[PDB]
Protein backbone atom coordinates (compact mmCIF):
# COMPACT_ATOMS: atom_id res chain seq x y z
CA UNK A 1 0.00 0.00 0.00
CA UNK A 2 0.93 3.68 -0.11
CA UNK A 3 2.11 5.20 3.18
CA UNK A 4 2.12 9.00 3.35
CA UNK A 5 3.40 11.16 6.21
CA UNK A 6 2.09 14.71 6.45
CA UNK A 7 4.28 16.08 9.23
CA UNK A 8 3.88 19.54 10.73
CA UNK A 9 6.91 21.81 10.51
CA UNK A 10 5.31 24.70 12.35
CA UNK A 11 7.37 26.25 15.14
CA UNK A 12 4.98 24.59 17.60
CA UNK A 13 7.16 21.47 17.33
CA UNK A 14 10.01 23.56 18.63
CA UNK A 15 8.52 22.99 22.06
CA UNK A 16 10.26 20.27 24.04
CA UNK A 17 9.07 17.52 26.36
CA UNK A 18 10.43 16.50 29.74
CA UNK A 19 12.80 14.22 27.81
CA UNK A 20 14.85 17.16 26.58
CA UNK A 21 13.65 16.38 23.06
CA UNK A 22 11.57 18.46 20.70
CA UNK A 23 8.20 17.34 19.37
CA UNK A 24 9.64 17.36 15.84
CA UNK A 25 12.33 14.89 16.88
CA UNK A 26 9.74 12.78 18.68
CA UNK A 27 7.74 12.69 15.44
CA UNK A 28 10.81 11.61 13.48
CA UNK A 29 11.53 8.85 16.00
CA UNK A 30 7.92 7.69 15.87
CA UNK A 31 8.07 7.50 12.07
CA UNK A 32 11.35 5.57 12.31
CA UNK A 33 9.87 3.00 14.68
CA UNK A 34 6.79 2.85 12.44
CA UNK A 35 8.75 1.88 9.34
CA UNK A 36 10.83 -0.54 11.40
CA UNK A 37 7.56 -2.25 12.35
CA UNK A 38 6.40 -2.05 8.74
CA UNK A 39 9.62 -3.78 7.66
CA UNK A 40 8.94 -6.38 10.35
CA UNK A 41 5.73 -6.87 8.40
CA UNK A 42 6.61 -8.75 5.17
CA UNK A 43 4.45 -6.29 3.18
CA UNK A 44 7.32 -3.75 3.21
CA UNK A 45 8.11 -4.72 -0.38
CA UNK A 46 4.69 -3.38 -1.33
CA UNK A 47 4.89 -0.45 1.09
CA UNK A 48 5.92 2.99 -0.20
CA UNK A 49 6.62 5.80 2.28
CA UNK A 50 6.32 9.42 1.07
CA UNK A 51 6.69 12.72 2.93
CA UNK A 52 4.79 16.04 2.87
CA UNK A 53 5.51 19.15 4.97
CA UNK A 54 3.30 22.11 5.82
CA UNK A 55 5.30 24.60 3.74
CA UNK A 56 4.19 26.16 0.46
CA UNK A 57 4.50 24.16 -2.78
CA UNK A 58 6.56 23.23 -4.80
CA UNK A 59 8.48 22.38 -1.64
CA UNK A 60 5.40 20.96 0.13
CA UNK A 61 6.08 17.48 -1.27
CA UNK A 62 9.39 15.95 -0.20
CA UNK A 63 9.40 12.33 -1.39
CA UNK A 64 7.73 11.40 -4.66
CA UNK A 65 6.51 7.94 -5.61
CA UNK A 66 9.68 7.35 -7.63
CA UNK A 67 11.96 8.12 -4.66
CA UNK A 68 13.81 5.52 -2.61
CA UNK A 69 14.44 4.82 1.06
CA UNK A 70 17.77 6.65 1.19
CA UNK A 71 16.34 9.92 -0.12
CA UNK A 72 13.30 9.44 2.11
CA UNK A 73 15.57 9.02 5.17
CA UNK A 74 17.63 12.06 4.20
CA UNK A 75 14.62 14.32 3.74
CA UNK A 76 12.72 13.16 6.84
CA UNK A 77 15.74 13.63 9.05
CA UNK A 78 16.90 16.91 7.51
CA UNK A 79 13.48 18.52 7.88
CA UNK A 80 13.68 21.78 9.82
CA UNK A 81 10.98 23.56 11.84
CA UNK A 82 10.15 26.87 10.17
CA UNK A 83 6.59 26.52 8.86
CA UNK A 84 3.12 27.46 10.04
CA UNK A 85 0.09 25.46 11.14
CA UNK A 86 -1.54 25.49 7.69
CA UNK A 87 -3.21 22.12 8.15
CA UNK A 88 -5.95 22.73 5.60
CA UNK A 89 -3.54 23.78 2.85
CA UNK A 90 -1.18 20.87 3.56
CA UNK A 91 -4.02 18.32 3.65
CA UNK A 92 -5.45 19.77 0.44
CA UNK A 93 -2.09 19.46 -1.32
CA UNK A 94 -1.65 15.87 -0.12
CA UNK A 95 -5.12 14.74 -1.17
CA UNK A 96 -4.71 16.60 -4.47
CA UNK A 97 -1.57 14.54 -5.09
CA UNK A 98 -3.47 11.35 -4.22
CA UNK A 99 -6.38 12.21 -6.54
CA UNK A 100 -3.96 13.18 -9.32
CA UNK A 101 -2.27 9.78 -9.01
CA UNK A 102 -5.67 8.03 -8.99
CA UNK A 103 -7.01 9.77 -12.08
CA UNK A 104 -3.68 9.28 -13.88
CA UNK A 105 -4.06 5.55 -13.20
CA UNK A 106 -7.62 5.85 -14.48
CA UNK A 107 -9.08 3.07 -12.33
CA UNK A 108 -11.74 5.58 -11.21
CA UNK A 109 -14.79 4.22 -13.04
CA UNK A 110 -16.78 7.44 -12.98
CA UNK A 111 -20.31 6.70 -14.15
CA UNK A 112 -19.52 2.96 -14.20
CA UNK A 113 -20.14 1.95 -10.60
CA UNK A 114 -17.29 1.51 -8.15
CA UNK A 115 -15.17 -1.60 -8.68
CA UNK A 116 -14.02 -3.11 -5.35
CA UNK A 117 -11.15 -4.88 -7.11
CA UNK A 118 -9.80 -1.53 -8.31
CA UNK A 119 -8.14 -0.22 -5.14
CA UNK A 120 -5.22 2.07 -4.33
CA UNK A 121 -5.02 1.68 -0.54
CA UNK A 122 -3.29 4.73 0.90
CA UNK A 123 -2.83 5.56 4.57
CA UNK A 124 -1.87 9.14 5.39
CA UNK A 125 -0.57 9.94 8.88
CA UNK A 126 -0.69 13.59 9.90
CA UNK A 127 1.52 14.49 12.86
CA UNK A 128 0.64 17.63 14.82
CA UNK A 129 0.72 18.82 18.41
CA UNK A 130 -2.92 19.90 18.50
CA UNK A 131 -2.18 23.61 18.79
CA UNK A 132 -4.30 26.33 17.22
CA UNK A 133 -4.35 26.87 13.47
CA UNK A 134 -2.06 29.62 12.19
CA UNK A 135 -2.54 31.68 9.05
CA UNK A 136 -0.95 34.87 7.71
CA UNK A 137 -4.42 36.40 8.05
CA UNK A 138 -4.70 35.32 11.68
CA UNK A 139 -5.91 32.45 13.81
CA UNK A 140 -8.54 29.98 12.60
CA UNK A 141 -10.78 28.02 14.95
CA UNK A 142 -12.11 25.53 12.36
CA UNK A 143 -10.34 23.26 9.89
CA UNK A 144 -11.61 25.01 6.76
CA UNK A 145 -10.52 22.93 3.81
CA UNK A 146 -9.91 25.32 0.88
CA UNK A 147 -12.54 25.25 -1.83
CA UNK A 148 -10.57 26.67 -4.77
CA UNK A 149 -9.23 23.66 -6.70
CA UNK A 150 -6.82 24.41 -9.57
CA UNK A 151 -6.70 20.68 -10.33
CA UNK A 152 -9.29 19.94 -13.05
CA UNK A 153 -11.77 17.13 -12.56
CA UNK A 154 -11.98 17.46 -8.78
CA UNK A 155 -15.64 18.44 -9.21
CA UNK A 156 -16.49 14.83 -10.15
CA UNK A 157 -16.23 13.97 -6.44
CA UNK A 158 -17.76 16.00 -3.63
CA UNK A 159 -14.91 15.19 -1.25
CA UNK A 160 -11.17 15.59 -1.91
CA UNK A 161 -10.45 12.10 -0.58
CA UNK A 162 -11.68 8.68 -1.72
CA UNK A 163 -12.74 5.51 0.07
CA UNK A 164 -9.30 3.89 -0.23
CA UNK A 165 -7.53 6.67 1.67
CA UNK A 166 -7.45 6.51 5.46
CA UNK A 167 -6.17 9.49 7.43
CA UNK A 168 -4.95 9.13 11.00
CA UNK A 169 -3.85 12.11 13.08
CA UNK A 170 -1.26 11.92 15.84
CA UNK A 171 -1.58 14.71 18.41
CA UNK A 172 1.45 15.39 20.59
CA UNK A 173 0.43 16.30 24.14
CA UNK A 174 3.56 15.40 26.08
CA UNK A 175 3.70 17.58 29.22
CA UNK A 176 6.52 20.00 29.88
CA UNK A 177 7.43 18.28 33.13
CA UNK A 178 7.35 14.58 33.86
CA UNK A 179 3.82 13.29 34.37
CA UNK A 180 3.70 12.29 38.05
CA UNK A 181 0.52 10.34 37.30
CA UNK A 182 1.25 6.83 36.02
CA UNK A 183 -0.90 6.02 32.99
CA UNK A 184 -3.00 2.94 33.73
CA UNK A 185 -5.00 3.41 30.52
CA UNK A 186 -5.19 0.26 28.40
CA UNK A 187 -6.66 2.19 25.46
CA UNK A 188 -6.05 5.32 23.42
CA UNK A 189 -8.46 8.18 24.26
CA UNK A 190 -9.70 10.25 21.35
CA UNK A 191 -8.34 13.76 20.89
CA UNK A 192 -10.28 17.03 20.92
CA UNK A 193 -9.16 18.88 17.80
CA UNK A 194 -10.45 20.27 14.52
CA UNK A 195 -8.59 17.50 12.69
CA UNK A 196 -10.73 14.93 14.55
CA UNK A 197 -14.04 15.50 12.64
CA UNK A 198 -12.30 15.26 9.26
CA UNK A 199 -10.43 12.20 10.55
CA UNK A 200 -13.73 10.57 11.50
CA UNK A 201 -15.32 11.56 8.17
CA UNK A 202 -12.50 10.01 6.15
CA UNK A 203 -12.52 7.01 8.48
CA UNK A 204 -9.69 7.35 10.96
CA UNK A 205 -9.17 7.36 14.70
CA UNK A 206 -7.08 10.39 15.61
CA UNK A 207 -4.77 9.72 18.55
CA UNK A 208 -3.40 11.99 21.27
CA UNK A 209 -0.27 10.85 23.10
CA UNK A 210 1.39 11.63 26.42
CA UNK A 211 4.14 9.03 27.09
CA UNK A 212 6.47 6.88 24.94
CA UNK A 213 4.91 3.62 26.17
CA UNK A 214 1.42 4.40 24.95
CA UNK A 215 3.03 6.10 21.96
CA UNK A 216 4.35 2.64 21.09
CA UNK A 217 0.85 1.31 21.78
CA UNK A 218 -0.58 3.85 19.31
CA UNK A 219 2.10 2.97 16.77
CA UNK A 220 1.43 -0.77 16.97
CA UNK A 221 -2.29 0.02 16.75
CA UNK A 222 -1.61 1.80 13.45
CA UNK A 223 0.59 -1.13 12.35
CA UNK A 224 -2.34 -3.48 12.93
CA UNK A 225 -4.51 -0.88 11.18
CA UNK A 226 -2.43 -1.08 7.99
CA UNK A 227 -4.78 -3.10 5.77
CA UNK A 228 -6.62 -2.82 2.45
CA UNK A 229 -10.34 -2.20 2.22
CA UNK A 230 -13.19 0.07 1.22
CA UNK A 231 -14.68 2.80 3.42
CA UNK A 232 -18.47 2.66 3.08
CA UNK A 233 -21.22 4.73 4.68
CA UNK A 234 -23.82 2.40 6.19
CA UNK A 235 -27.37 3.65 6.65
CA UNK A 236 -30.32 1.70 8.02
CA UNK A 237 -33.15 1.32 5.50
CA UNK A 238 -36.75 0.64 6.43
CA UNK A 239 -37.88 0.19 10.03
CA UNK A 240 -35.90 -1.19 12.92
CA UNK A 241 -35.46 -4.99 12.89
CA UNK A 242 -37.53 -7.16 15.18
CA UNK A 243 -36.01 -7.46 18.68
CA UNK A 244 -35.00 -10.92 19.85
CA UNK A 245 -37.82 -12.66 21.71
CA UNK A 246 -35.29 -14.39 24.00
CA UNK A 247 -34.70 -11.12 25.85
CA UNK A 248 -36.97 -8.82 27.80
CA UNK A 249 -38.40 -5.79 25.93
CA UNK A 250 -36.17 -2.89 26.98
CA UNK A 251 -38.28 0.16 27.79
CA UNK A 252 -35.14 2.33 28.00
CA UNK A 253 -34.23 1.80 24.33
CA UNK A 254 -33.36 5.23 22.86
CA UNK A 255 -35.69 6.32 20.05
CA UNK A 256 -33.29 7.78 17.51
CA UNK A 257 -30.55 7.17 14.98
CA UNK A 258 -28.16 4.55 16.33
CA UNK A 259 -24.45 4.40 15.50
CA UNK A 260 -25.17 0.93 14.13
CA UNK A 261 -28.05 2.48 12.19
CA UNK A 262 -25.58 4.97 10.71
CA UNK A 263 -21.88 4.22 11.07
CA UNK A 264 -19.09 4.71 8.52
CA UNK A 265 -17.14 1.46 8.38
CA UNK A 266 -14.44 -0.26 6.37
CA UNK A 267 -14.78 -3.63 4.65
CA UNK A 268 -11.56 -5.57 4.15
CA UNK A 269 -10.83 -6.48 0.52
CA UNK A 270 -8.41 -9.39 0.71
CA UNK A 271 -6.35 -9.84 -2.49
CA UNK A 272 -6.01 -13.22 -4.15
CA UNK A 273 -3.00 -15.01 -2.57
CA UNK A 274 -2.29 -16.71 -5.91
CA UNK A 275 -2.12 -13.44 -7.86
CA UNK A 276 -1.72 -10.60 -5.36
CA UNK A 277 -4.48 -8.62 -7.10
CA UNK A 278 -7.88 -8.15 -5.42
CA UNK A 279 -10.64 -9.96 -7.30
CA UNK A 280 -14.19 -8.68 -7.63
CA UNK A 281 -17.02 -9.14 -10.07
CA UNK A 282 -19.88 -6.74 -9.31
CA UNK A 283 -19.40 -3.01 -8.67
CA UNK A 284 -21.79 -1.21 -6.34
CA UNK A 285 -24.60 0.74 -8.06
CA UNK A 286 -24.26 4.47 -8.55
CA UNK A 287 -26.41 7.07 -6.80
CA UNK A 288 -27.84 8.11 -10.18
CA UNK A 289 -29.07 6.35 -13.28
CA UNK A 290 -26.39 6.30 -15.99
CA UNK A 291 -27.83 8.47 -18.76
CA UNK A 292 -26.44 7.98 -22.26
CA UNK A 293 -27.69 11.46 -23.22
CA UNK A 294 -26.35 13.47 -20.27
CA UNK A 295 -23.38 15.67 -21.27
CA UNK A 296 -22.30 15.78 -17.60
CA UNK A 297 -22.32 13.28 -14.76
CA UNK A 298 -23.50 13.94 -11.18
CA UNK A 299 -20.66 14.28 -8.64
CA UNK A 300 -20.37 11.06 -6.67
CA UNK A 301 -19.51 10.94 -2.98
CA UNK A 302 -16.14 9.83 -1.65
CA UNK A 303 -17.74 6.89 0.11
CA UNK A 304 -20.51 4.71 -1.38
CA UNK A 305 -23.68 5.56 0.54
CA UNK A 306 -25.62 2.28 0.74
CA UNK A 307 -28.84 1.48 2.59
CA UNK A 308 -29.43 -1.86 4.31
CA UNK A 309 -32.97 -3.08 4.82
CA UNK A 310 -32.96 -5.01 8.14
CA UNK A 311 -35.64 -7.43 6.96
CA UNK A 312 -34.26 -10.93 7.48
CA UNK A 313 -34.52 -12.87 4.23
CA UNK A 314 -33.17 -16.14 2.89
CA UNK A 315 -29.81 -15.79 1.10
CA UNK A 316 -30.45 -17.68 -2.13
CA UNK A 317 -27.43 -19.38 -3.69
CA UNK A 318 -27.03 -20.69 -7.24
CA UNK A 319 -23.91 -22.64 -8.20
CA UNK A 320 -21.14 -21.16 -10.38
CA UNK A 321 -22.33 -17.62 -9.63
CA UNK A 322 -19.45 -15.13 -9.33
CA UNK A 323 -20.26 -13.15 -6.19
CA UNK A 324 -18.08 -10.79 -4.17
CA UNK A 325 -17.77 -11.79 -0.50
CA UNK A 326 -15.80 -9.42 1.70
CA UNK A 327 -15.19 -9.23 5.45
CA UNK A 328 -16.24 -6.15 7.41
CA UNK A 329 -14.46 -4.25 10.15
CA UNK A 330 -15.87 -4.93 13.64
CA UNK A 331 -18.50 -2.34 14.43
CA UNK A 332 -21.67 -1.69 16.46
CA UNK A 333 -23.49 -2.95 13.35
CA UNK A 334 -21.57 -6.24 13.28
CA UNK A 335 -21.91 -6.49 17.07
CA UNK A 336 -25.69 -6.11 16.78
CA UNK A 337 -25.81 -8.77 14.05
CA UNK A 338 -23.72 -11.20 16.11
CA UNK A 339 -25.95 -10.42 19.09
CA UNK A 340 -28.97 -11.31 16.95
CA UNK A 341 -27.12 -14.59 16.16
CA UNK A 342 -28.75 -15.18 12.77
CA UNK A 343 -26.20 -16.60 10.31
CA UNK A 344 -28.96 -18.26 8.27
CA UNK A 345 -30.67 -14.98 7.34
CA UNK A 346 -29.33 -11.81 5.77
CA UNK A 347 -30.16 -8.12 5.49
CA UNK A 348 -30.43 -6.67 2.01
CA UNK A 349 -28.28 -3.79 0.82
CA UNK A 350 -29.35 -1.28 -1.83
CA UNK A 351 -28.12 1.94 -3.41
CA UNK A 352 -30.48 4.91 -3.67
CA UNK A 353 -31.43 6.12 -7.18
CA UNK A 354 -29.91 3.00 -8.76
CA UNK A 355 -33.05 2.62 -10.90
CA UNK A 356 -34.71 5.05 -13.29
CA UNK A 357 -38.08 4.85 -11.51
CA UNK A 358 -37.25 3.39 -8.07
CA UNK A 359 -35.76 5.78 -5.52
CA UNK A 360 -34.40 2.99 -3.33
CA UNK A 361 -33.76 0.85 -6.39
CA UNK A 362 -33.49 -2.93 -6.38
CA UNK A 363 -31.40 -5.07 -4.01
CA UNK A 364 -27.83 -5.60 -5.15
CA UNK A 365 -26.37 -7.37 -2.14
CA UNK A 366 -26.78 -8.53 1.41
CA UNK A 367 -24.90 -8.47 4.68
CA UNK A 368 -24.81 -11.95 6.20
CA UNK A 369 -23.35 -13.25 9.45
CA UNK A 370 -20.66 -15.89 9.07
CA UNK A 371 -21.32 -19.55 9.87
CA UNK A 372 -19.14 -19.40 12.99
CA UNK A 373 -20.86 -16.09 13.98
CA UNK A 374 -17.46 -14.40 14.28
CA UNK A 375 -18.03 -11.65 11.70
CA UNK A 376 -20.45 -10.23 9.14
CA UNK A 377 -19.60 -10.51 5.45
CA UNK A 378 -20.92 -8.46 2.55
CA UNK A 379 -22.10 -10.52 -0.43
CA UNK A 380 -22.36 -8.50 -3.64
CA UNK A 381 -24.41 -10.00 -6.50
CA UNK A 382 -25.56 -8.47 -9.81
CA UNK A 383 -28.14 -5.73 -9.37
CA UNK A 384 -31.73 -6.97 -8.95
CA UNK A 385 -30.51 -10.46 -8.12
CA UNK A 386 -33.98 -11.66 -6.85
CA UNK A 387 -35.15 -11.00 -10.43
CA UNK A 388 -32.06 -12.30 -12.25
CA UNK A 389 -31.42 -15.53 -10.31
CA UNK A 390 -34.83 -17.22 -10.94
CA UNK A 391 -34.33 -16.43 -14.64
CA UNK A 392 -30.91 -18.12 -14.58
CA UNK A 393 -32.41 -21.08 -12.70
CA UNK A 394 -35.17 -21.43 -15.31
CA UNK A 395 -32.66 -21.12 -18.16
CA UNK A 396 -30.09 -23.60 -16.84
CA UNK A 397 -32.51 -26.07 -15.23
CA UNK A 398 -35.41 -26.18 -17.71
CA UNK A 399 -34.35 -24.34 -20.87
CA UNK A 400 -30.85 -25.96 -20.84
CA UNK A 401 -29.23 -22.71 -22.08
CA UNK A 402 -31.83 -22.51 -24.89
CA UNK A 403 -34.02 -19.55 -23.90
CA UNK A 404 -37.70 -19.40 -24.77
CA UNK A 405 -39.18 -16.17 -26.10
CA UNK A 406 -41.02 -15.48 -22.83
CA UNK A 407 -37.77 -16.00 -20.90
CA UNK A 408 -35.96 -13.80 -23.43
CA UNK A 409 -38.41 -10.92 -23.02
CA UNK A 410 -38.42 -11.28 -19.22
CA UNK A 411 -34.62 -11.19 -19.28
CA UNK A 412 -34.73 -8.17 -21.60
CA UNK A 413 -37.07 -6.34 -19.21
CA UNK A 414 -34.55 -7.17 -16.49
CA UNK A 415 -31.82 -5.75 -18.76
CA UNK A 416 -33.85 -2.56 -19.20
CA UNK A 417 -34.09 -2.22 -15.41
CA UNK A 418 -30.39 -3.14 -15.19
CA UNK A 419 -28.05 -0.12 -15.08
CA UNK A 420 -26.14 0.24 -18.36
CA UNK A 421 -22.56 -0.41 -17.23
CA UNK A 422 -23.24 -3.81 -15.63
CA UNK A 423 -23.50 -5.65 -18.97
CA UNK A 424 -19.78 -6.48 -19.05
CA UNK A 425 -19.55 -8.40 -15.77
CA UNK A 426 -22.98 -9.87 -16.53
CA UNK A 427 -21.65 -11.06 -19.90
CA UNK A 428 -18.60 -12.63 -18.22
CA UNK A 429 -20.81 -14.28 -15.59
CA UNK A 430 -23.20 -15.75 -18.17
CA UNK A 431 -20.32 -16.95 -20.36
CA UNK A 432 -18.78 -18.71 -17.36
CA UNK A 433 -22.04 -20.41 -16.46
CA UNK A 434 -21.81 -21.49 -20.10
CA UNK A 435 -24.14 -19.53 -22.42
CA UNK A 436 -21.98 -16.90 -24.16
CA UNK A 437 -24.60 -16.51 -26.92
CA UNK A 438 -27.37 -15.66 -24.43
CA UNK A 439 -26.24 -12.02 -24.62
CA UNK A 440 -25.12 -10.97 -28.08
CA UNK A 441 -22.03 -8.91 -28.83
CA UNK A 442 -23.89 -6.14 -30.67
CA UNK A 443 -25.44 -4.17 -27.79
CA UNK A 444 -23.03 -2.16 -25.61
CA UNK A 445 -24.66 0.59 -23.54
CA UNK A 446 -21.65 2.89 -23.47
CA UNK A 447 -21.45 6.34 -21.94
CA UNK A 448 -22.07 9.49 -23.96
CA UNK A 449 -19.28 10.65 -26.27
CA UNK A 450 -19.16 14.11 -24.68
CA UNK A 451 -18.41 12.60 -21.26
CA UNK A 452 -15.94 10.15 -22.84
CA UNK A 453 -14.03 12.95 -24.60
CA UNK A 454 -14.13 15.06 -21.43
CA UNK A 455 -12.68 12.17 -19.43
CA UNK A 456 -9.97 11.59 -22.05
CA UNK A 457 -8.99 15.28 -22.06
CA UNK A 458 -9.05 15.17 -18.25
CA UNK A 459 -6.68 12.19 -18.36
CA UNK A 460 -4.34 14.09 -20.70
CA UNK A 461 -4.31 17.10 -18.38
CA UNK A 462 -3.69 14.71 -15.48
CA UNK A 463 -0.67 13.30 -17.32
CA UNK A 464 0.62 16.86 -17.81
CA UNK A 465 0.01 17.61 -14.12
CA UNK A 466 1.79 14.41 -13.06
CA UNK A 467 4.74 15.32 -15.30
CA UNK A 468 5.03 18.79 -13.80
CA UNK A 469 4.70 17.40 -10.25
CA UNK A 470 7.51 14.94 -11.08
CA UNK A 471 9.58 17.89 -12.28
CA UNK A 472 8.73 20.01 -9.24
CA UNK A 473 9.42 17.38 -6.57
CA UNK A 474 12.95 17.24 -5.19
CA UNK A 475 13.62 20.99 -5.30
CA UNK A 476 15.27 22.36 -2.16
CA UNK A 477 14.65 25.75 -0.58
CA UNK A 478 15.99 28.83 -2.38
CA UNK A 479 17.82 31.33 -0.18
CA UNK A 480 17.34 34.92 -1.31
CA UNK A 481 19.51 38.02 -1.47
CA UNK A 482 16.56 40.17 -2.47
CA UNK A 483 16.38 43.94 -2.19
CA UNK A 484 15.22 45.06 1.25
CA UNK A 485 13.17 48.23 0.69
CA UNK A 486 13.48 50.92 3.39
CA UNK A 487 12.98 54.68 3.70
CA UNK A 488 13.19 57.27 6.45
CA UNK A 489 22.83 52.85 -4.56
CA UNK A 490 19.50 53.84 -6.10
CA UNK A 491 16.62 51.99 -4.37
CA UNK A 492 17.99 48.58 -5.42
CA UNK A 493 20.28 47.62 -2.56
CA UNK A 494 20.37 44.38 -0.59
CA UNK A 495 22.62 43.49 2.33
CA UNK A 496 23.77 39.93 1.70
CA UNK A 497 22.71 37.19 4.11
CA UNK A 498 25.04 34.52 5.45
CA UNK A 499 25.04 31.18 3.62
CA UNK A 500 26.04 27.91 5.25
CA UNK A 501 26.59 26.39 1.81
CA UNK A 502 29.11 29.08 0.87
CA UNK A 503 32.24 26.84 0.73
CA UNK A 504 34.90 29.53 0.15
CA UNK A 505 37.85 28.82 -2.13
CA UNK A 506 40.76 30.41 -0.27
CA UNK A 507 43.32 29.05 -2.72
CA UNK A 508 41.52 30.07 -5.92
CA UNK A 509 40.20 33.44 -4.71
CA UNK A 510 42.03 36.12 -2.78
CA UNK A 511 39.00 37.93 -1.36
CA UNK A 512 38.77 35.12 1.19
CA UNK A 513 41.56 34.61 3.76
CA UNK A 514 40.68 37.20 6.44
CA UNK A 515 43.33 39.27 8.11
CA UNK A 516 44.17 36.92 10.98
CA UNK A 517 45.31 33.95 8.84
CA UNK A 518 46.73 35.95 5.94
CA UNK A 519 50.46 35.29 6.28
CA UNK A 520 49.91 31.60 6.96
CA UNK A 521 47.70 31.06 3.92
CA UNK A 522 50.20 33.05 1.85
CA UNK A 523 52.98 30.67 2.85
CA UNK A 524 50.56 27.83 2.17
CA UNK A 525 49.83 28.82 -1.44
CA UNK A 526 53.53 29.45 -1.96
CA UNK A 527 54.43 26.01 -0.64
CA UNK A 528 51.72 24.47 -2.82
CA UNK A 529 52.77 26.25 -6.01
CA UNK A 530 56.49 25.72 -5.45
CA UNK A 531 55.99 22.08 -4.54
CA UNK A 532 53.89 21.44 -7.68
CA UNK A 533 53.36 17.69 -7.59
CA UNK A 534 51.27 15.67 -10.03
CA UNK A 535 48.11 16.53 -8.07
CA UNK A 536 47.34 20.10 -6.99
CA UNK A 537 44.64 20.94 -4.46
CA UNK A 538 42.24 23.89 -4.23
CA UNK A 539 40.93 23.27 -0.70
CA UNK A 540 42.93 23.07 2.52
CA UNK A 541 40.38 21.13 4.62
CA UNK A 542 38.79 18.41 2.49
CA UNK A 543 38.22 15.95 5.31
CA UNK A 544 34.75 14.53 4.50
CA UNK A 545 31.08 15.43 4.09
CA UNK A 546 28.75 13.11 5.94
CA UNK A 547 29.89 9.48 6.11
CA UNK A 548 33.03 7.37 5.70
CA UNK A 549 32.31 3.98 4.07
CA UNK A 550 34.68 1.05 4.52
CA UNK A 551 33.12 -0.75 1.55
CA UNK A 552 33.59 2.30 -0.68
CA UNK A 553 37.21 2.69 0.44
CA UNK A 554 37.93 -0.97 -0.26
CA UNK A 555 36.20 -0.67 -3.63
CA UNK A 556 38.34 2.35 -4.57
CA UNK A 557 41.36 0.37 -3.39
CA UNK A 558 42.71 -2.85 -4.89
CA UNK A 559 43.72 -6.03 -3.04
CA UNK A 560 46.11 -8.19 -5.09
CA UNK A 561 46.21 -11.05 -2.59
CA UNK A 562 43.62 -13.80 -3.00
CA UNK A 563 45.32 -16.13 -0.45
CA UNK A 564 43.40 -19.33 -1.30
Amino acid sequence: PILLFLIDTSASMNQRSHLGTTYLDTAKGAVETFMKLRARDPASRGDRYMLVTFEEPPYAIKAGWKENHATFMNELKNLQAEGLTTLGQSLRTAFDLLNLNRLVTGIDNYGQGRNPFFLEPAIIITITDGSKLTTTSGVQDELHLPLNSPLPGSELTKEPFRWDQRLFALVLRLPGTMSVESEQLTGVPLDDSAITPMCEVTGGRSYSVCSPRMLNQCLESLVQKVQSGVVINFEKAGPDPSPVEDGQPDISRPFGSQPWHSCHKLIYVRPNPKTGVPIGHWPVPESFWPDQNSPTLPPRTSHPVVKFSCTDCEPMVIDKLPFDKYELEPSPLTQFILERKSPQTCWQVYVSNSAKYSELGHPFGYLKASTALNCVNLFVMPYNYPVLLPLLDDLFKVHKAKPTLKWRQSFESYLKTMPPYYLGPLKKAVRMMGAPNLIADSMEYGLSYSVISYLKKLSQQAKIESDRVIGSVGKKVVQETGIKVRSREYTGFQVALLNKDLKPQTFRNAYDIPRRNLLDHLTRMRSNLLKSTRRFLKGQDEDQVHSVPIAQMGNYQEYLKQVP
Binding site: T481, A496, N499, L502, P504, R508, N509, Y511
Partner: peptide
Protein backbone atom coordinates in the same frame (compact mmCIF):
# COMPACT_ATOMS: atom_id res chain seq x y z
CA UNK B 1 40.26 37.62 -12.62
CA UNK B 2 38.42 37.59 -9.31
CA UNK B 3 36.93 41.08 -8.74
CA UNK B 4 34.95 40.47 -5.51
CA UNK B 5 33.75 38.00 -2.91
CA UNK B 6 32.94 34.65 -4.48
CA UNK B 7 29.33 33.89 -3.34
CA UNK B 8 28.08 37.42 -4.04
Amino acid sequence: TSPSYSPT
